[PDB]
Amino acid sequence: TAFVVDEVSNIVKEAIESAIGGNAYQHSKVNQWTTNVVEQTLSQLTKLGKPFKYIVTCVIMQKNGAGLHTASSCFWDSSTDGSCTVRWENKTMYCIVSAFGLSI
Amino acid sequence: ATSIGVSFSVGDGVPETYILRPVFQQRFRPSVVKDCIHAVLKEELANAEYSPEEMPQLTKHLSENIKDKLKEMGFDRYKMVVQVVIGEQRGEGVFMASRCFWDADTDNYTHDVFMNDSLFCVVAAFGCFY
């Protein structure tokens, strides 16, 4: 069927919560955290059974007063392909997750 | 100081008689894509001062420009995704992970880094066959 953004968006939000929810920023775990987010997000996406090849990215930055900025541009079939991006934030870090669905 | 950590991983299997496979000369070439990306970053960002308020639109400008450059590289039958990440130089750095469920025999990716006095940038580009 189709790439349902709110369906993907809730998957992303729960994956972020499962991985870093309730944790303050630790330098010793940040790379492990980004990997955990994309691992969970992709696994929950593949379980939908839809005919897509997925790209999932997670970006984490410690909060210092400095900002974090992202954007994506694609060259695909907009009638079939889609994307979802969630910007998550707590008292100590930013986390931005982008999931792209490319139909086959 | 500025710390940047970028990683990549692929899920097992290929999402789903005959198959089509890309011809070598038209494949998504990471080495070529890198050289296009760094040329774009060098020209657009070289050392020009950017305020923090200019950065949100700057990312879209770079992503669109990089995407348009890649469209003229002869990569036939490839859908392409370009993600651009920018942080202000005052920050400690940025960390990023990418994971794909695709065809590891046909699809490929690039990670690239640029920095100047105002900002540091990370570019991730992906090419999926067919």
Numbering used by the authors:
A (entry chain A): 10 to 113
B (entry chain B): 2 to 17, 28 to 141
Relevant lines from the article:
Dynein-2 is a large multiprotein complex that powers retrograde intraflagellar transport (IFT) of cargoes within cilia/flagella, but the molecular mechanism underlying this function is still emerging. Distinctively, dynein-2 contains two identical force-generating heavy chains that interact with two different intermediate chains (WDR34 and WDR60). Dynein-2 is the essential motor for retrograde intraflagellar transport (IFT), the conserved process in which polymeric IFT “trains” translocate cargoes along the ciliary microtubules. A 3.9 Å resolution structure shows how WDR34 and WDR60 use surprisingly different interactions to engage equivalent sites of the two heavy chains.
At the base, there is an additional density in the cryo-EM map that likely corresponds to DYNLT1/DYNLT2B, but which is too weak to permit model building. Previous data show that DYNLT1 and DYNLT2B interact, making a heterodimer the most plausible stoichiometry, but a dimer of dimers has not been ruled out. We therefore purified the DYNLT1-DYNLT2B complex, used SEC-MALS to show it is a heterodimer (mass of 28.1 kDa), and determined its structure at 2 Å resolution using X-ray crystallography. The structure reveals a domain-swapped heterodimer that accounts for the unfilled density in the cryo-EM map. We then used AlphaFold (AF) Multimer to generate a high-confidence prediction of the regions of WDR34 and WDR60 that interact with the DYNLT1-DYNLT2B heterodimer. In this model, WDR34 residues P37-S50 bind an edge strand of DYNLT1, whereas WDR60 residues D469–P512 bind an edge strand of DYNLT2B, bend through 90 degrees, and form an α-helix that wraps around DYNLT1-DYNLT2B. The DYNLT1-DYNLT2B-binding region of WDR60 is in precise agreement with that mapped biochemically, providing experimental validation for the model. In summary, these data suggest that the N-proximal regions of WDR34 and WDR60 are held together by a DYNLT1-DYNLT2B heterodimer, contrasting with the other dynein-2 light chains which are homodimers. The N-proximal region of WDR60 wraps around the DYNLT1-DYNLT2B heterodimer, providing an explanation of why the binding site is large relative to other DYNLT-binding proteins that interact with one face only.
